[PDB]
Amino acid sequence: SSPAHLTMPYVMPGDGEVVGVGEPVAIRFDENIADRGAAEKAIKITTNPPVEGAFYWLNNREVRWRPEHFWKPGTAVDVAVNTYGVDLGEGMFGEDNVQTHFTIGDEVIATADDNTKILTVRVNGEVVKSMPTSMGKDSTPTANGIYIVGSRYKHIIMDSSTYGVPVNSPNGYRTDVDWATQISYSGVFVHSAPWSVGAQGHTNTSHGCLNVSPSNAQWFYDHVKRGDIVEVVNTVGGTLPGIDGLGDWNIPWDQWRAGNAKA
Template identity: 70%
Template structure:
């Protein structure tokens, strides 16, 4: 019986080995069958598309004008700005090839014209931007605005004058101004110390600025009339810019008293002179109120015919007057 048990164990062991061997053979056959039926796997190839960030590093150019633009304003500078880099050479020329002055910003990113452009002119702009991704170049040609008509401003008081405390600022144009607000917005008045004031129009061609109160002696006044490039209405543009700087002198006030026929003159509140005056005819009285002294002449012919009264009529006259002054 012991012999039978051993035989039985050996038989089971051989059976297990046979199963394992059969399994290995079957697995080998299966693997070989798969290998023989599959095509060779192609090698993996990675295409070289370059640096994926290179396009992001290419510099860009942006300009305030577009190629082929017409009617470009002349009162604003033309600018060119580099993105993702700095500017290289920038040139701008007119139709005759004459360069236009311009200036590069300290960081090298923006270029802007520093001189006014002309009306109805053609300009060509060339610019380069330099960056890590290379160089970008751009060229454009454009034309400025073409006004239907131009008007020239004239400003008073003149530059460097010393004027009285009642002196208004006058800006006169040689054309009627359709858009008065546009004209006013083009005029700046800067005073030291600051003074409040307002505009008012005497006619369609003359605007004035007067302080709310009399000027203080010693006040400095700077007036800038920047109408060049400004549309003043109906295709009328400013022909040029003007400026003036003047100073307010002593307070000199002359008071005319019709009851005593006397003119009293005070400087800074102190009476310095009195003189007799006729005050004219009773039929043409002078209205009460405050007047300012305008134009002054060492000698002037006063002729009644200049306002429609013949010299040889009863109310006519023609007089040679010294130290004539205009009051208004």
């Protein structure tokens, strides 16, 4: 198989998953797609209850599809990527078809307000939990906007070595973190921060992550799922880029729906 001439699609969420109301459909190709319009035409997304949605490309290989507003809980989504033998541009053909079926679970929206420094978790519109947080310092602030819950980790190592920065160096690090819920590809997590417990709810002290107590971070880890939402408001930061990877909802609908198949 030639990487220039054959490409395989991969769809997320996986088959049979239950995801949050912020989860887009993601179709990722293992090669660059020259004809984005062809790829979009080959993908059929069925929703029940039916809802309008549209495609937007985050990069040369990954397209996302979502509705204008957060999904309605209980919605069933069927995705048919019918790319087998389809010309995806410049002598590049789809290698296979892929399918997924998934459903949307409860609406879970956690709001962090820099005025109160509380992260308030709402489930189907009802407050179920409040937790003190310490967000990014004025000089390294947490960006405002809408974040989608991604991967979670009971334990994770943030290692500078991965970026070529040696651990034993001024900017180097090899850091152990518990109960880490990823909310941006750029590396924003909700996580256990035993080191900032006294500041949580009061003063911002972090590098941009949402520091919470060990117990509250375990709670968060236990009670969220992929596609749930974290909203950050009133920080001195900018807005999370729409093309972060988990920042899809920061792109206004009129921009999203116009797409970038020809842009």
